[PDB]
Amino acid sequence: EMRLSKFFRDFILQRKK
């Protein structure tokens, strides 16, 4: 199943934080 991916990478991609 999936849940966190679009949003996860939507931010994870950002090193900061």
Side-chain angles (χ1 to χ4, degrees), residues 2-16:
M2 239 182 266
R3 215 167 257 279
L4 242 320
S5 147
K6 202 305 208 256
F7 173 110
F8 191 78
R9 255 141 281 282
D10 166 293
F11 159 78
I12 288 280
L13 86 169
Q14 258 126 39
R15 279 238 91 181
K16 268 72 66 121

